[PDB]
Amino acid sequence: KHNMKAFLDELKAENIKKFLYNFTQIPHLAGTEQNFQLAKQIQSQWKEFGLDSVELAHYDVLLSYPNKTHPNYISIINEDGNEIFNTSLFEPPPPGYENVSDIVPPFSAFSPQGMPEGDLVYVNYARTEDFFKLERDMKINCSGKIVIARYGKVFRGNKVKNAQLAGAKGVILYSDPADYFAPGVKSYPDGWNLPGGGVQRGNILNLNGAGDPLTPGYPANEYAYRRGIAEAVGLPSIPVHPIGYYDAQKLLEKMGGSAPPDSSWRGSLKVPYNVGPGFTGNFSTQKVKMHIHSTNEVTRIYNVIGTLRGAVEPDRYVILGGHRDSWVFGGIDPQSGAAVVHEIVRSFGTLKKEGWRPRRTILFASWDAEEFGLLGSTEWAEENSRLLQERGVAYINADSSIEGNYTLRVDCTPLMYSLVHNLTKELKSPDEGFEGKSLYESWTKKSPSPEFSGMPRISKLGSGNDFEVFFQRLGIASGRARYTKNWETNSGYPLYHSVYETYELVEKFYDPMFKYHLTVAQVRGGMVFELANSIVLPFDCRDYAVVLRKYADKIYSISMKHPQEMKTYSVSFDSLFSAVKNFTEIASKFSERLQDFSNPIVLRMMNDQLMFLERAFIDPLGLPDRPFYRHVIYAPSSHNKYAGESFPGIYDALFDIESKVDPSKAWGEVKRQIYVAAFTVQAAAETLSEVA
């Protein structure tokens, strides 16, 4: 039989292992020849595997690279202008890779050039609340200072935006052992921890879903009109550079000024974690100098797009996509995901060769330039937005398959919750101590839902990955799954975006039997299989009703911290709860009809109502000042692009509202967002009513 079981059984751990090794021998940095060559290899193999069509879709987008002959570094300088300490120019390469060419040295992609010199301020994680603490409580002024921040907690682009708004003239990012060195584990190559010379690369843009900085709204094709750099979206205005903790210790150890305000500001280095500004008495005339000479350059990038045409609904697309570009070797990020995609394509193709086809079209994507701001997926979705809008059933992401070996992690739209529960009950757990048990059982035991007994935790979609354009801009039901660590005995994984993130890292420490990779291939591949083949789309609208009520309770509880203002300005959540109540009623009735209808028009009408339900949460006017975040229920947090926020329009209107100098105007805007949200929830509900 050609059924999900056939598809699943054909997936092999050893294949995924072979593909991961194959993809991680040399760096595949976006816009380089090596990553174009990998694209052509993947294109060829997907054709060999049996896909109907496999094309490259290329764009010319703004990328950023260090200058090979003018290296980036940071100094402590003395009064005579002698640079008495310099940060490293590269990470010591790991065993056996010491002769590998083209390893990009650590840098912050899209930093402007500059050589600012000044006094340091330490800002903890550079989060919104860290700057509140500095400015409001500690009375420390960052204006004209170089800020040093530890990586962790939030997306590094938000840190830079926060430092810029505080008036900083530069930012130094560093990896603190508190956040990147698990106690009792050895650093690479002897364990999975970050060595003192290791450094996290990464872009520092604030694109808010725009895609290529020069072409917001439109694909960066051969005739595209480009904004001038001064009008580009999301570039930082101050120099930024990342360092490791050996180098950070040399920068922090001399810090004077104010003590850290409390223990949450202290990392693990043997330094006082003084906030500054500047150095203690004897060193008070020394300064910090950055030297950044990276350049932004419009560069060609290549997505691979594979199509497996549907037998019955070829105009309905289920998309499995993940990136291919990496900072260096991409042992975890993204090649552990890309190897799983490759095996999934291979398995679907085996079935296709035996005469099978999925009901709906499956599209497979290898995205480029994800690490530079989700550029490849976003340009392609801009090019194809009309097809995606009217035909996109779902998008399943496929970045890093593992960040740990403890349990599953799933983030998805509520419309997929029931699909994911059902699938994981039919998969075997690969966990020690759960042999013969389902993945659902092990996952539920290791990661219980905070709200329901006997259910697992499933998180909201945030961002920082290639689903953002499909979900938050276009309103296509989206999901992701991977294996993760125990968050209660441990900040991602330590070697993230370092030269040390290699094939050996995965093979030796994360997943030597490739059983977690295989489990992840079964979950992603199985979701795609069900989405593409189920007669009725496997979305349960009733799960959206439950979460909408949870999010309405949550946003109301935030507002209710301000009872006097709610009285004064007549701020009511009645309309939103009314909309949520109606959504619950209409969804329940729709579910009954879905169960209770041989009629393919009624089916397809009902599948269309299912497919367009996520779409109904899109507001074509976008959220305030973020026109590419159009989904009214979910947006990336304005304080941390990685985290999802629910009812983001209302959340941001209420955020720090007590500090707004015109409360009438601020509360007016809260009420406006309540209206927009109530209206959108009711409008989405009405898409599930009888159509005439």
Ligand X SMILES: O=C(O)CC[C@H](NP(=O)(O)OCCC[C@H](NC(=O)CC[C@H](NC(=O)c1ccc(F)cc1)C(=O)O)C(=O)O)C(=O)O
Ligand Y SMILES: *[C@@H]1O[C@H](CO)[C@@H](O[C@@H]2O[C@H](CO)[C@@H](O[C@@H]3O[C@H](CO[C@H]4O[C@H](CO)[C@@H](O)[C@H](O)[C@@H]4O)[C@@H](O)[C@H](O[C@H]4O[C@H](CO)[C@@H](O)[C@H](O)[C@@H]4O)[C@@H]3O)[C@H](O)[C@H]2NC(C)=O)[C@H](O)[C@H]1NC(C)=O
Ligand Z SMILES: *[C@@H]1O[C@H](CO[C@@H]2O[C@@H](C)[C@@H](O)[C@@H](O)[C@@H]2O)[C@@H](O[C@@H]2O[C@H](CO)[C@@H](O)[C@H](O)[C@H]2NC(C)=O)[C@H](O)[C@H]1NC(C)=O
Ligand U SMILES: *[C@@H]1O[C@H](CO)[C@@H](O)[C@H](O)[C@H]1NC(C)=O
Ligand V SMILES: *[C@@H]1O[C@H](CO)[C@@H](O[C@@H]2O[C@H](CO)[C@@H](O)[C@H](O)[C@H]2NC(C)=O)[C@H](O)[C@H]1NC(C)=O
Ligand W SMILES: *[C@@H]1O[C@H](CO)[C@@H](O[C@@H]2O[C@H](CO)[C@@H](O[C@@H]3O[C@H](CO)[C@@H](O)[C@H](O)[C@@H]3O)[C@H](O)[C@H]2NC(C)=O)[C@H](O)[C@H]1NC(C)=O
Tokens for 138? Answer: 């500690």
682 Cβ contact list (under 8 Å, min separation 6): 578, 579, 582, 583
Spatial CA neighbour of 690 closest among 621, 632, 609: 609
| CB of residue 70 to ligand Z, shortest distance in Å | 4
Q: How far apart are CA 650 and CA 647, in angstroms?
A: 6
Going residue by residue from 325 to 354, which x/- string records binding to ligand X, judged by CB under 6 A?
Answer: --------x---------------------
| Angle at alpha carbon of residue 53, lines to 49 and 58, rounded to 5° | 110
215 interacts with, out of Ca ion, ligand Y, ligand X, none, CB within 5 to 8 A per kind: Ca ion
**Under the criterion CB under 5 A, does residue 399 sit at the interface with Zn ion?**
yes
Tell whether residue 551 is among the known ligand binding residues: no
209, 462 contact by CB (below 8 A) = no
Residue 588, helix vs strand vs coil: helix
Tell whether residue 464 is among the known ligand binding residues: yes
**Which one among 39, 120, 374, 419 touches ligand W, defined by CB under 6 A?**
419
| CB of residue 546 to ligand Y, shortest distance in Å | 18
**Under the criterion CB under 6 A, does residue 538 sit at the interface with ligand W?**
yes
Q: How far apart are CA 365 and CA 579, in angstroms?
A: 37
Going residue by residue from 315 to 354, which x/- string records binding to its own copies, judged by CB under 8 A?
Answer: x-x-------------------------------------
Strand-pairing partners, residue 412, are 479
Residue 293 is among the residues annotated as catalytic for this protein: no
Residue 608 is among the residues annotated as catalytic for this protein: yes
Using the rule CB under 6 A, give the single segment among 37-45, 594-602, 609-617, 662-670 that binds ligand V.
37-45
Q: Interface residues for its own copies in 196-225 (CB under 8 A)?
A: 217-219, 221, 223-225
- How many C-beta neighbours within 10 Å does residue 231 have? 11
Q: How far apart are CA 457 and CA 407, in angstroms?
A: 11
**Under the criterion CB under 6 A, does residue 568 sit at the interface with ligand X?**
no
- How many C-beta neighbours within 10 Å does residue 299 have? 18
Residue 67: φ, ψ to 5°: -85, 115
Q: How far apart are CA 358 and CA 355, in angstroms?
A: 10
| CB of residue 302 to its own copies, shortest distance in Å | 19
Q: Interface residues for Ca ion in 208-267 (CB under 5 A)?
A: 211-212, 215, 220
Going residue by residue from 465 to 484, which x/- string records binding to ligand X, judged by CB under 6 A?
Answer: x------------------x
**Under the criterion CB under 6 A, does residue 678 sit at the interface with ligand Y?**
yes
Residue 147, helix vs strand vs coil: strand
422 interacts with, out of Zn ion, ligand W, Cl ion, none, CB within 5 to 8 A per kind: ligand W
Q: How far apart are CA 396 and CA 348, in angstroms?
A: 15
Please give the size of the binding site for ligand Y, defined by CB under 6 A.
9
211 interacts with, out of Zn ion, ligand V, Ca ion, none, CB within 5 to 8 A per kind: Ca ion
Q: Interface residues for ligand Y in 580-609 (CB under 6 A)?
A: 582
Q: How far apart are CA 91 and CA 104, in angstroms?
A: 10
**Under the criterion CB under 6 A, does residue 490 sit at the interface with ligand W?**
no
Residue 370 is among the residues annotated as catalytic for this protein: yes
381, 473 contact by CB (below 8 A) = yes
Tokens for 190? Answer: 């002897």
| CB of residue 384 to Ca ion, shortest distance in Å | 12
| CB of residue 327 to Zn ion, shortest distance in Å | 6
Q: How far apart are CA 440 and CA 442, in angstroms?
A: 6
Residue 631 is among the residues annotated as catalytic for this protein: yes
Strand-pairing partners, residue 85, are 76
**Under the criterion CB under 6 A, does residue 25 sit at the interface with ligand V?**
yes
**Which one among 84, 89, 115, 312 touches its own copies, defined by CB under 8 A?**
312
Nearer to ligand Y, 270 or 386 (CB): 386
**Which one among 41, 82, 264, 557 touches ligand V, defined by CB under 6 A?**
41
Beta strand pairing status for 313-323 and 392-397?
Answer: parallel
Residue 667: φ, ψ to 5°: -70, -30
580 Cβ contact list (under 8 Å, min separation 6): 545, 548, 549, 552, 681
Using the rule CB under 6 A, give the single segment among 367-375, 578-586, 592-600, 660-668 that binds ligand Y.
578-586
Q: Interface residues for ligand Y in 202-231 (CB under 6 A)?
A: 222
**Which one among 60, 399, 614, 645 touches ligand X, defined by CB under 6 A?**
399
Tell whether residue 253 is among the known ligand binding residues: no
Binding site for Zn ion (CB under 5 A): 333-334, 399
User: Which amino acids are annotated as binding site for Zn(2+), given as ranges?
Assistant: 323, 333, 371, 399, 497
Catalytic residues: 370, 572, 608, 631
